[PDB]
Every structure is written in structure tokens, then in C-alpha cells.
Amino acid sequence: PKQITDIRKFLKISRKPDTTAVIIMKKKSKTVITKLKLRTKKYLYTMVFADRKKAERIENSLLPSLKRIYYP
Amino acid sequence: AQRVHYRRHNHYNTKSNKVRPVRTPGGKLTIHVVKKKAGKPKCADCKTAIQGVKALRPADNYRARRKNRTVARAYGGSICARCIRERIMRAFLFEEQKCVRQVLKE
Amino acid sequence: VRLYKLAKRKGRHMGIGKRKGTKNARTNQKTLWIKRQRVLRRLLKRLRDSKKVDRHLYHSF
Amino acid sequence: SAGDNINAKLQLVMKSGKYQFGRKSCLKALRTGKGKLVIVSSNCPSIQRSVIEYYAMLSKCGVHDYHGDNNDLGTACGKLFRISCLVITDVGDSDIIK
Amino acid sequence: SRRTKKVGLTGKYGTRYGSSLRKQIKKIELMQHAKYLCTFCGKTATKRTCVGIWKCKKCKRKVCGGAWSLTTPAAVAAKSTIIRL
Amino acid sequence: GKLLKPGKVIIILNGRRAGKKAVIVNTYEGQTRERPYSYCLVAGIEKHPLKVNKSMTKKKIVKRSKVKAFIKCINVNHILPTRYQVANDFDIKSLASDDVLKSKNKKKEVKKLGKIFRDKFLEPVEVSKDISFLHKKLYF
Amino acid sequence: GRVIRGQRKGRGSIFKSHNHHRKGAAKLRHLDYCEKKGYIKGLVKDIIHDPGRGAPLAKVIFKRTEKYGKKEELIIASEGMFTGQYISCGTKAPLSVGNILPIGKMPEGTLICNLEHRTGNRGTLVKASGCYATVVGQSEDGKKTKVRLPSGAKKTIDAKARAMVGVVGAGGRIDKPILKAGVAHHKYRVKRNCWPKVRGVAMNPVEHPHGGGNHQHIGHPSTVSRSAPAGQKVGLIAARRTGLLRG
RNA sequence: GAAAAGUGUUUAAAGGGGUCCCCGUCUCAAAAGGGAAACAGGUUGAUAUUCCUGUGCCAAUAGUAUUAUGAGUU
RNA sequence: UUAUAACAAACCUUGGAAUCAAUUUACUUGGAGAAGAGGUUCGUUGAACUCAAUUCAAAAA
RNA sequence: UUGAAAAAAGGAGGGAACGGCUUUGUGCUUUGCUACUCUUAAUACUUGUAUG
RNA sequence: AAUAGAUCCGUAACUUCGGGAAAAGGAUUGGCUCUGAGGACAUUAAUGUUAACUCAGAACUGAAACGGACAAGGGGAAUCCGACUGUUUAAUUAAAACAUAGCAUUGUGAAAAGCCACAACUGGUAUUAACACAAUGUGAUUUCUGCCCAGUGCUUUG
RNA sequence: UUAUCCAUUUAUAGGGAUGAAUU
Ligand SMILES: [Mg+2]
Ligand SMILES: [Mg+2]
Ligand SMILES: [Mg+2]
Ligand SMILES: [Mg+2]
Ligand SMILES: [Mg+2]
Ligand SMILES: [Mg+2]
Ligand SMILES: [Mg+2]
Ligand SMILES: [Mg+2]
Ligand SMILES: [Mg+2]
Ligand SMILES: [Mg+2]
Ligand SMILES: [Mg+2]
Ligand SMILES: [Mg+2]
Ligand SMILES: [Mg+2]
Ligand SMILES: [Mg+2]
Ligand SMILES: [Mg+2]
Ligand SMILES: [Mg+2]
Ligand SMILES: [Zn+2]
């Protein structure tokens, strides 16, 4: 499992066709934190956002053939 | 205390079967087998450890990226810098001496 | 046990009669020496760094 | 007798004169051209000795193979550490240059 | 306080083994555990590894030599003869 | 005297250029906040001309005797100076330029240097010993 | 009766050598064109313990004259050899401690070791720690040379036979008492199982000529003929004299 | 050696690596030596580092042809 | 190659040491280059460290 | 008493060999043009069914 | 049975000067309430936050008791044997037997040697080489080891 | 010396004057 910090890199990864599923998790922080996981054939890449709206926007951006798993 | 047991087949306290007791998310204390500490790769002359080489076991050395095995000198990851220097000096100076000897003869 | 430990902290149960290990077993002479030397040497190092003591003096001390 | 003379000369240099001992300093001196004469102990490890010789040749400096050990070369000078090679960069009253 | 008068290195042996034997050991143990003068680096660092093998700590040059001393007399004599030749 | 005069050939002792032989072009010997050490600036050969037979064809010979060069500023304490001096057989100022060490097209400069070296090897003159020395790969 | 301890040794079962940790056989160079007509120099790359031996070994590396590659010999180290010393071997070698020369080319008085008794034998005499032989003469006929072995014995060898100038390392190892039984235990533990030695006189008759009696005594002369058989040859074999040696 | 067996390079024409040369007895012998790679949680009446969920790791992966990925050379 | 941090070592540059110095619980080490100053690496370790991200504001190419 | 070996792996030394396509003559030589040599991953297709 | 743990004291003969030695032989020991000694850090010599556990001393206290159970040498003066640690008759003998270091003797210079094995070849010692291997005896140290070569053995000349 | 015997090595140049070393 890997972490991602460059949003652009994440986007690129998403664009790449072996990325079957996205996992999008909501977490009550000690505000609503959001973890964006992409499930690639090789690795499970995750991005952490402090900011909900940004997270939402990025989710929206994600290709609509991704197999989105809303965990909690 | 939480007690433990070997899980991998080898149930004796050998150098290969050394063990690091580790806490799980479950709360169970488990035993994890430590991969042995490898020997630092050494100089073809003085048998001192060569720098810039990850000391890895022969299994793990095969996988590691070529930068982690090599150093970019001449004799590289087989001879330390000091020794290399000395070798170079020998190669030059002795050659020079030979020439001098020849001159003397003639 | 906690009460006992508190009492020991105030020095209470420690005492000739309540003592079965040799002096070294109770608290190792070697460990005490180590402590002391480390304390002293550290202090010396500090002093020399501050320049409050000169090299020569430090070394002899 | 020769050895004694050499020792005396060394002493003289120490008293009045500019020197510096040990490989690196000596080499530096040679590179500069500041070295007038280098004196090298019997026990100086072969390669380094050779290097020193080469440097001297390049600078047309004298090479003097000191008869005695590392230890002696040091005792010959005022010093309680073993020496190996030293470079006189100015002779005072002393003759050793000639 | 200097602890032992006559014994020195053979205090480890204690009461056991003849006094004569311990005396002999003493010479040899002194010879063994001395740091000898290294003929290359100068430093008195040649201590004994194995029996006839003497490693300088400084330069790491293993000199073959005596079992107890670094140089036996016979060997030295031989060397001298060779030099003369 | 001053051992390392511009044009003298030296053997590098340290670094990636470990046992490579080279010509010094401009000595500095001035310690600074940037480079707190007397340094030499050197133009040398990494990959020497390979051994060649009379039997071989000319193009192939030329290919064989390509000489891959390098330009490196180096601590004088890392170089073994030689008796050999090539102030004559090269216009030395033309080999390496101080200013161009900084510049972007350093690889271009290196290439040019290499070409020059190759040319020199092709036309030796009468035949200097220094140049011969430079030609031969140091075996250690 | 039973088979005596001595007899058991020859079958070599537990009585074989403890060969496991030994570094290899100590041998001179093969006798090549080099060594016969000139000299070859090798580097002593390391000086090492060979367990069951008392004398340290020198791994000496030579460069093979007939194929590109370095090959290692195991020489017995003379005193004064050291790592990074060059050892030279051959007819026209120079006479220095360490070097390997035909006995013909060493003046009288020279001290030698690792001596081949026949040429090519890869060196056989004077190998034990401390020991040396002396060249005592070379005949006016040339050819043979007279040597004096550590025993005292004088022997005549070929002059072409090689040897090593100097004395073998680890001298005087016998000077220091073993003191403890355990140190002897450790000594033989690396050689072969010849230790403890129970006394024949402490055994029963089934076991040993000396065995039995209500007293612990040998009971019959303990000098036995050369021409005895296996279980008889037990006391002082073939003894020319006995008692405290006066000569 | 009558064989059965006894010895294992002692006087061999004893399979591998490269593009003819160069190496070279075979085989078995370690479930504590050497060694490619695994963890957690869950689950059964009875198995689990072996199933389940999840997360990895290791070793392969023939040729030819496209694609992309980056290097290097002009 | 977990990223980094810290630490025992090993090495590099500089520096040039007797009024010897650094230094360990222990002794070890030094003109074959010590201390000091700045680095490199392996090894422990496996999120230590502001570690990473983000918040906006100021200075370079 | 100096404290296994080998499989396996790695590093170094060394400098063997060297672009591709088209045309001509008996794998080699000559003539003309500039995307080449690697590299992982995916994909396709024949070859026994090419993942444990 | 007594002795025993610890702390403090004291510790002889004799000795191979290492030991003997925990010699012998004394004292103290609980609980409570205090006192003193012993660090780290970080402010700026004084003032802070703060940590073990150990030592030493003093009051009071009790049916004079306290290593309160548990656990834990009996010691000395000699003599005999074996120097010692070690090993041994599995299921009656643990020793004074064996071993041991030390000592001394003996053989052997080599693949035609020594010692031993094998039916035979061949092997072991030996990946060895006289400071070695083999074979005996005695059994640390100290101090010595006298006389006898006729008897028997071994051996040297031919 | 040719039988026989022993040794030595990869059966590796016919006899005399502490670098590298291969196509
Ligand atoms: Mg103590
Ligand atoms: Mg005995
Ligand atoms: Mg016995
Ligand atoms: Mg009996
Ligand atoms: Mg009988
Ligand atoms: Mg009896
Ligand atoms: Mg008796
Ligand atoms: Mg098998
Ligand atoms: Mg195993
Ligand atoms: Mg079960
Ligand atoms: Mg006893
Ligand atoms: Mg006992
Ligand atoms: Mg019994
Ligand atoms: Mg007995
Ligand atoms: Mg006695
Ligand atoms: Mg008598
Ligand atoms: Zn080295």
C-alpha cells in the first residue's frame, strides 16, 4: 500500500486502465476527513484530504467507469 | 504476560530461527521470524567493509537495485577507496621505476 | 504493593534485616561506578565546551 | 658517525629552521616547491616512500633515506611520536642541504 | 595496591599446578601477552593471534614468528647469516 | 618548483575517474567558501583507444580509437603528478575553458575535447613520450 | 585374548584423523619449467592457523605461467615471513628467508625447512613447529648434498631437491607446559583420538600384555623384539638400551 | 576375490560452459546447518500463516509484431 | 529499497597536534594525520523527526 | 582449542562483438537512405493447452 | 538437631605466597517517624521542572522480637591415601581404582621408514614428517631416584 | 636401460648464460 501526495500523480494513476476500483472513506477527525484509495492491479494508492469540498471535487473528477466503494 | 509460540515449522532457537515478539491488532502477542543479519561485503585486500553497498543476504542481493550493490570507482564494490589509491600508485610508480632501471642499464 | 513501594520510597522497608542479597546484588558496584564516571565525564565535557575549563586542565581532571 | 652528524643537523634545524613532518604536509610542500630536502625513515611504507621520491624528483629536491626507523626519526627530532618522513622547507644555520 | 608479589599473570591458576610449572608459565605468558614492536609501522602493537602468528593492530600485517615470543633466537641467527651472505 | 604547471599530465587517484590519466589545464590553489581546497581543473580520458592491428580496415580502426574524455575540477591532493608534460602537443587553453565548466553544453565541450584527443592520437608529431604515456591505459 | 588398543588404531574408524577443519595439505609448488630454470615470485596473501598442526600456514599466490589466472599454494611459514612478502622459488632464486631453493645452491650452514627428500616430492622433511635442517655439505661430484635433520640423523639428498631457507614458525611451542588435562584434551580433539592413554598395566590380561596381577606390575621384560607381532609389540619396541639416557 | 563381497583414481578414451577451446566422478546424507517469497483479522463440530475478506511478497513469463514507459546516441 | 530522524562504527575534505590530546564501564586511537569544523556510507531501528501534506504571505531561476 | 562446506547470488578486472532498411556479387564484400540500440509493462498472434 | 541470608568487625597454623578463608569467633537485623548522601534536564552564580532505586545515620515502638514463614555451611585439631578439576563397575563396590599435567624411556628420516589394519589388492596414522607419529612406564609441586648386566629379555659387530 | 617399482601434475617450455601481466 502506497500513499500519494501529488494530486496530479493520483489523477494520472486514475486515468490508467488497470485501476479497477476506488475506495472513498469518511473519518471523524479529532470535521470530516476523506481518504481516497485507488485499487491498482499492483498497489493500493491512497490520498488523504483534510478538506471535504476538495475531496468531493476530486471524486467527481474520477472516471465514471471506476467501481466506487463507499466504505462506512 | 501474553505467552507465544513459534509458528514456522522450525521450533528450535537457531540463528535462522530468531524471533521478534510482536503485538497484533487483535491484541495477541505473536512471534515473527527475523531474517538473519547479513555480513558487510569486504575488500579484496584488507578485509574491511566496503561502503556504498547494502549488506544483504544472497537471496536479497539479487533483487536489490544495481546502485545498492555497486560503487562507481574503478575496482568499485570489490576494493575500498584507500586500497584503490594504493594500487593506482603502485601501477604508476613501479612502471616509472622500471623505465628508470632500463635507462640505467642502457 | 503500591503502599509497600511508597514506604520503600520513604526508605522504610529497606533495612539490614530485610536484605538478603550482597551489596553488589542489591545495586551493582560496577553500575554505580559507570553512573558516576558518566556523570563526571559528561560534566567535564560540558565545561570544556563552554570554555569554562581549558583542555589541559580538563584532561588531567 | 654519518648518522650522528645527520642527527646533529636535524637538531640544529629543529632549533632554528622551518620544517614539517608527516606524509600529507610533506607532499604539499613538495607540490609548492617550498621543500628543500626530505628525509625519509627506513620504515616508511613502500608506496608512500616511492611517491615521496617521485615528488622530490619532480621538484629537483634531495631525498635523504634516513638510516633509522620511524621511531628513531621522531626521537631524532624533538618529538615523542613516530615520524616516517619530514620536509625541511628552510635550513637555519644547518648544513644538511649541502 | 599491587596485588600479587611473585605470581603476576599466573594468579588465574591459583593454588593448583606446581609452583615450578607456574614459574615456567610466567615467562612464557609474559612473552605471549606482551605487545611487541612492529617492524613495519613502528608501533608496539604486534600481539599474538594464533600460535606462530602475530598481528599488528595498526597495519594488519600478520608476521609469522615464534609460539610465545615474536622472534626466537635460532630464527634470528638464521636471518643474520642470510643477511651476511 | 611548482609541480602542477598547466599542461602537465597527472593521474587522478580518487572518485569516478579513479585511475584515469589526464592533463591539468588551470591550477588555482586559492581556498574559498565554495571550494575550501587547492584544486586543479583537469581534462582527461575515461575510455582509451582500444588496441588495433595493421590488418584492420581504416574506418573500423578509427571507431576503435575513439577516445571518450572528461573535464573535472579536482583537489590537488587527489592527483599524482607525472614527469610527463603536454603543453606543446595541445593548445592547452583550447581544451578546457574555466567559464564553460559552469555552462549548460558541458557535454558538447567534452565531445569536442574527445575529438581533439582522437585527432592528436592520429597525428602524433618527433613523437613525444608524454603523448605515448597519455595514450596507454593505466593497468592496476 | 582381546584386540589391544594399538591394533584397533589401524582399522581407522574412530581412530582416523579429525580432518574437518584443516585448511588443506601443505605442499610446495609443482616442479615446473619456471622453478627448474629460473625463479617465480608469489605473494604471501595471508598467514593462517591450520588446526591439527602446530606451525602456521602461509597461503602464497603464484601466477600460472601457462594460463592466465592466480593459483594458491599452501606453504608452511618460516619464522619471519609476513603478509605481502614476496616468496621466490627456483634454481636461480636469491637466498632470502622464505624463498625456495634447490639445496645445491645454498652454502653450508644454511638453515632450511619443507625439504623434499626426492625431487618433486612437494616437500616432506622438517615441517614441525620450530624445526630446521642444516646443509652440511655438497659433494665435489655435485649432484648430492648432505643435510642434518632435527633428529640428528645425517642424510644425503639430491641437490636438485628443493627446500625453504629459514626455520619453521611457532618455535618453542613445547617449552610451555600444557598444565591442564583439558588443554591436552583440546590439543588432541583437533588431531585424532589418541588421548587419554590408559596404562596396559592398569588393564586386565585380555586387554594388554601387561594386564592383570594382584599388584600392577609388568611381570615380564618390557623390551620387545622388532620381529614381534601385532599384540606383542607393546613396551619399548626394539630397545637398544633402556634407562635414564646418559649420552 | 572361486564367487559373495572388499576397496573408490591406485595405469579411464568418466557430463557441463563458451564459439574447436575450456572446465569436470556420479549419487544419496540435515523436516534444528545453508536457503526465493506472508501478514493481519475473520470462519468450522472437527482445518487453518493452508479456507474467507483484505493487504502484499517471490519466481518464472518462448518467439514474432504492434503499442505505450522512459533512457542513451544524431 | 518503507521516507526521514537519532545513534555505535567505518571512511572523506579541511585542519596540523608536546604544556601531549581525544576517549571508554574497560582500552583504545593519533605526523601511516589527532582534536576541532563540515560531510559520505553501512548497520541498527521502522513515523523517531515538523516526517509529509496543506494555509496563505515574502526571496531566487 | 583460532571455531564447516557447497548450492545460490553479487561485485570487480578484462575489452570479444556491434546501428537498421534497400540493391549488387560469391555467412562475407561493395553501393544508397535515416529513426536507431536498450528498457520494463500491456496487447495480439501462430508454436502441444505459455502461472504457481 | 544445631549452623546458615545480609551488613560491620575479626580472621591462626601452614603455604607451592596464589590460598587457607565464609577459617575460627563476635555483633547487628522488625515496624514506624524522620535526617543526610547519590542524577537528569533548562532558564539566567541564583531560580525552576523532575527521576529512579540504593546506601548511611537518629528518634520512638513491642511480653527483647525481627534473614519471625520460606530459604539457608556445623566448625575445629590431627593422621592415612590420592596433588588437583575430571572418569568409572546402567541394576549391591564412586574409591585410595582410571585419567591428568609433569617426568622418563623406546622406535622411526618415509611411500623398500615406524606403529597398525586387510583374505587379497590396499589401506589407517597421514590434508602427517622428529617441537612429528607410534609405543611403554611413572603420575602436580618440592626433594631425591643408590648398588647389581650373573639369571631372563631387548640390542650391536660378523 | 626396456621389465618392475615409487613419486609428481592439468602428465604443461629438449639442454646451458601486499598493482597489472589473458583474446
Ligand atoms: Mg569490580
Ligand atoms: Mg603420559
Ligand atoms: Mg596413563
Ligand atoms: Mg583392574
Ligand atoms: Mg595376553
Ligand atoms: Mg589389582
Ligand atoms: Mg602401583
Ligand atoms: Mg540431497
Ligand atoms: Mg534448515
Ligand atoms: Mg484442533
Ligand atoms: Mg582424587
Ligand atoms: Mg571429584
Ligand atoms: Mg553399580
Ligand atoms: Mg593413578
Ligand atoms: Mg607424588
Ligand atoms: Mg633405581
Ligand atoms: Zn582494504
Side-chain angles (χ1 to χ4, degrees):
Chain A
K2 318 199 87 198
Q3 186 154 221
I4 308 299
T5 64
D6 299 318
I7 297 165
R8 67 185 68 175
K9 202 210 169 183
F10 191 85
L11 288 167
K12 193 181 185 195
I13 292 162
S14 180
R15 214 60 32 75
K16 289 197 163 197
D18 291 37
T19 309
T20 58
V22 181
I23 334 296
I24 178 266
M25 198 212 55
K26 299 139 196 164
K27 225 286 191 68
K28 272 205 164 191
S29 56
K30 310 181 189 187
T31 65
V32 189
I33 270 49
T34 307
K35 234 115 158 204
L36 266 189
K37 322 199 195 190
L38 304 164
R39 170 66 273 182
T40 310
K41 202 216 297 192
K42 199 74 165 55
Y43 284 98
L44 183 127
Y45 298 100
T46 111
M47 191 159 200
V48 280
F49 314 101
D51 42 7
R52 262 294 288 182
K53 291 206 293 295
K54 181 95 81 181
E56 285 294 287
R57 109 172 67 173
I58 189 160
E59 191 188 332
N60 208 132
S61 169
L62 293 169
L63 276 44
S65 56
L66 271 290
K67 191 155 180 294
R68 229 152 295 181
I69 299 161
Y70 296 82
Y71 243 124
Chain B
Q2 207 63 52
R3 248 103 101 252
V4 269
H5 50 278
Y6 293 123
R7 294 195 292 147
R8 294 203 177 163
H9 191 85
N10 190 24
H11 273 252
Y12 300 78
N13 188 30
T14 354
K15 300 221 175 186
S16 52
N17 196 63
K18 292 300 185 196
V19 146
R20 200 176 217 285
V22 154
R23 304 192 69 197
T24 61
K28 294 200 167 196
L29 201 85
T30 50
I31 269 173
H32 274 220
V33 168
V34 172
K35 282 187 181 176
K36 281 191 288 176
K37 174 146 155 43
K40 293 155 188 166
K42 317 212 177 181
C43 193
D45 297 306
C46 209
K47 248 55 60 177
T48 57
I50 296 168
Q51 301 189 181
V53 188
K54 263 194 162 64
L56 296 166
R57 297 206 79 74
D60 309 332
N61 212 31
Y62 180 48
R63 299 175 228 136
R65 277 80 65 113
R66 203 202 149 193
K67 64 171 205 157
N68 291 296
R69 293 171 273 160
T70 314
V71 206
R73 244 103 75 264
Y75 276 70
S78 67
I79 311 192
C80 69
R82 173 68 66 74
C83 281
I84 273 163
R85 251 197 218 73
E86 296 161 357
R87 280 210 181 190
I88 293 161
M89 302 245 251
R90 240 177 289 268
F92 178 47
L93 274 20
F94 279 83
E95 236 61 23
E96 289 310 85
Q97 282 179 334
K98 286 168 194 173
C99 260
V100 169
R101 190 185 299 161
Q102 273 193 326
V103 165
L104 286 161
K105 280 205 170 185
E106 301 184 310
Chain C
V1 182
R2 281 171 200 152
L3 291 180
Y4 200 85
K5 279 200 162 185
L6 283 160
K8 284 207 81 180
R9 202 159 298 164
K10 297 187 175 176
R12 299 305 148 91
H13 297 294
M14 303 167 65
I16 292 164
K18 205 130 280 268
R19 217 194 285 158
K20 308 194 80 176
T22 28
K23 249 167 191 172
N24 294 49
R26 292 281 299 179
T27 23
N28 194 12
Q29 285 180 25
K30 175 135 176 160
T31 60
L32 281 154
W33 163 258
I34 288 153
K35 285 175 210 166
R36 196 215 315 197
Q37 275 295 285
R38 283 181 198 169
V39 168
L40 299 196
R41 285 172 180 185
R42 188 189 304 113
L43 165 133
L44 285 175
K45 301 223 177 178
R46 221 164 158 185
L47 285 178
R48 165 176 68 102
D49 295 0
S50 52
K51 307 209 171 176
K52 290 180 177 192
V53 178
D54 305 352
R55 282 193 313 164
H56 301 279
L57 200 171
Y58 158 99
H59 190 95
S60 75
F61 263 60
Chain D
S1 190
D4 185 31
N5 290 306
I6 292 300
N7 271 253
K9 288 160 185 165
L10 260 294
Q11 280 193 319
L12 228 308
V13 305
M14 258 72 263
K15 266 99 166 93
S16 293
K18 298 285 173 179
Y19 52 91
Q20 45 197 325
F21 15 70
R23 194 227 288 101
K24 277 148 62 169
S25 67
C26 144
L27 278 160
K28 194 213 211 81
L30 287 173
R31 203 145 51 232
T32 318
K34 290 183 297 194
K36 300 176 74 62
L37 177 268
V38 188
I39 125 168
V40 57
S41 72
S42 172
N43 264 211
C44 210
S46 302
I47 40 142
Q48 116 165 214
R49 171 193 272 280
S50 198
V51 175
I52 294 311
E53 293 287 323
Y54 202 66
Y55 270 55
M57 294 329 292
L58 293 206
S59 307
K60 304 85 138 55
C61 304
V63 292
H64 208 95
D65 58 329
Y66 183 65
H67 63 88
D69 208 305
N70 256 98
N71 303 131
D72 296 65
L73 213 188
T75 61
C77 171
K79 296 305 191 299
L80 288 162
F81 52 90
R82 94 276 301 188
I83 282 186
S84 309
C85 56
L86 87 178
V87 166
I88 56 170
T89 171
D90 190 273
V91 289
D93 290 15
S94 328
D95 300 328
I96 195 159
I97 191 67
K98 180 171 160 57
Chain E
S1 54
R2 197 193 69 196
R3 306 93 153 194
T4 62
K5 297 178 190 174
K6 311 196 182 208
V7 182
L9 332 188
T10 65
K12 63 173 168 144
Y13 299 121
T15 31
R16 56 212 133 73
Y17 323 111
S19 49
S20 63
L21 301 200
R22 287 194 319 274
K23 282 190 176 193
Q24 277 187 337
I25 282 274
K26 199 183 169 177
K27 290 203 173 193
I28 288 155
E29 266 216 313
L30 282 164
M31 266 174 274
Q32 255 192 112
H33 303 313
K35 290 151 190 161
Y36 285 96
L37 189 136
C38 183
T39 62
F40 312 113
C41 64
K43 189 167 190 197
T44 64
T46 20
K47 262 211 159 193
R48 202 192 77 150
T49 54
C50 311
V51 195
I53 309 175
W54 294 82
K55 186 158 198 178
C56 196
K57 270 193 174 174
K58 180 68 148 48
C59 39
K60 309 291 188 301
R61 274 192 150 170
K62 291 172 158 172
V63 178
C64 174
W68 318 123
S69 57
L70 204 152
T71 49
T72 59
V76 168
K79 188 157 186 173
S80 313
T81 304
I82 288 153
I83 287 163
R84 239 211 304 100
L85 289 166
Chain F
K2 297 222 79 189
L3 288 189
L4 10 80
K5 296 256 194 166
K8 184 146 274 70
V9 344
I10 57 155
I11 296 160
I12 302 284
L13 299 170
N14 282 239
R16 192 158 101 271
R17 315 308 191 187
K20 273 55 196 162
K21 45 178 77 179
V23 286
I24 73 193
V25 1
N26 191 33
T27 307
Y28 294 91
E29 290 174 29
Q31 298 200 331
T32 54
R33 191 181 296 94
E34 300 297 335
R35 317 183 89 81
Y37 48 86
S38 43
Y39 75 104
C40 212
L41 194 282
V42 205
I45 299 96
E46 255 291 336
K47 171 81 175 182
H48 284 97
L50 304 176
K51 288 155 279 169
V52 158
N53 269 226
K54 212 89 81 177
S55 306
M56 294 170 183
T57 69
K58 78 151 280 153
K59 291 180 185 180
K60 105 107 76 180
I61 289 167
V62 107
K63 272 189 286 187
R64 215 144 165 76
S65 78
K66 77 171 282 185
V67 51
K68 215 207 79 170
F70 68 87
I71 298 92
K72 159 165 271 180
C73 35
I74 195 165
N75 193 350
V76 303
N77 301 36
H78 296 346
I79 69 93
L80 212 180
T82 76
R83 60 199 258 266
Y84 309 117
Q85 178 252 48
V86 194
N88 303 34
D89 310 334
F90 299 113
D91 186 12
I92 207 80
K93 292 163 183 188
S94 304
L95 265 53
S97 299
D98 181 37
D99 196 52
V100 183
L101 185 61
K102 314 312 179 189
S103 185
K104 305 301 183 176
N105 54 214
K106 190 160 178 301
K107 57 173 70 233
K108 178 60 180 64
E109 186 196 26
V110 171
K111 289 275 183 163
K112 180 208 78 189
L113 207 314
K115 288 285 141 59
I116 244 290
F117 262 131
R118 192 180 66 187
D119 298 349
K120 179 67 227 175
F121 291 132
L122 273 27
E123 188 232 59
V125 180
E126 294 180 40
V127 183
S128 187
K129 305 298 125 64
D130 321 309
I131 221 74
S132 309
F133 173 83
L134 216 55
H135 178 72
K136 292 142 61 178
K137 176 146 154 289
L138 185 66
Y139 289 110
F140 62 101
Chain G
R2 218 157 203 76
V3 181
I4 54 148
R5 192 186 56 254
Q7 283 190 57
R8 267 148 22 66
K9 292 205 178 185
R11 300 191 339 118
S13 35
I14 62 160
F15 295 94
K16 286 197 284 73
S17 62
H18 309 331
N19 214 345
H20 189 237
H21 290 282
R22 291 188 200 172
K23 297 286 123 54
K27 300 288 171 170
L28 307 187
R29 195 90 158 74
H30 175 78
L31 222 192
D32 50 32
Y33 177 82
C34 331
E35 200 151 325
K36 287 188 202 176
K37 275 223 162 60
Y39 72 138
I40 335 176
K41 38 186 182 194
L43 286 160
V44 185
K45 260 289 148 191
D46 240 296
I47 288 177
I48 47 156
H49 199 62
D50 179 42
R53 215 185 297 267
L57 294 189
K59 264 183 170 175
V60 176
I61 294 193
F62 292 107
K63 286 178 161 162
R64 256 191 197 161
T65 318
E66 41 67 84
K67 180 179 75 190
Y68 163 68
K70 301 181 186 206
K71 281 80 174 190
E72 298 223 55
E73 292 291 342
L74 282 156
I75 295 177
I76 280 163
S78 53
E79 281 203 49
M81 300 205 332
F82 56 92
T83 56
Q85 193 190 253
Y86 279 105
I87 281 172
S88 33
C89 329
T91 311
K92 291 170 193 177
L95 210 156
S96 297
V97 171
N99 293 356
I100 291 164
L101 281 131
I103 314 132
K105 295 233 181 164
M106 296 188 251
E108 288 180 7
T110 50
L111 297 196
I112 56 175
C113 49
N114 286 250
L115 216 170
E116 324 198 304
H117 63 81
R118 282 170 171 188
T119 327
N121 200 24
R122 288 197 137 217
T124 29
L125 284 69
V126 191
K127 292 188 162 182
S129 72
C131 295
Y132 58 89
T134 318
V135 184
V136 192
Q138 292 122 118
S139 48
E140 291 183 312
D141 191 67
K143 289 212 172 182
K144 304 220 170 184
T145 299
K146 213 158 193 179
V147 148
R148 168 175 182 175
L149 301 167
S151 64
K154 228 181 169 197
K155 189 179 165 169
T156 42
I157 311 170
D158 299 348
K160 261 166 166 168
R162 295 134 63 206
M164 186 170 173
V165 199
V167 177
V168 177
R173 89 172 138 70
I174 56 141
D175 191 40
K176 138 130 102 155
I178 308 175
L179 281 202
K180 311 211 287 294
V183 174
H185 172 73
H186 289 316
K187 176 197 284 204
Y188 299 110
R189 197 198 87 263
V190 183
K191 279 164 162 189
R192 23 81 232 304
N193 110 279
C194 55
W195 196 66
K197 293 203 165 187
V198 187
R199 288 147 41 241
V201 80
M203 334 268 195
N204 313 117
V206 264
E207 295 135 18
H208 210 286
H210 297 356
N214 294 353
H215 270 308
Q216 267 221 28
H217 74 321
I218 311 167
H220 38 74
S222 71
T223 49
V224 189
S225 57
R226 255 279 98 73
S227 60
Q232 282 198 241
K233 252 189 286 185
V234 115
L236 314 180
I237 304 145
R240 296 187 180 77
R241 49 155 290 98
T242 41
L244 233 177
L245 196 60
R246 291 274 149 268

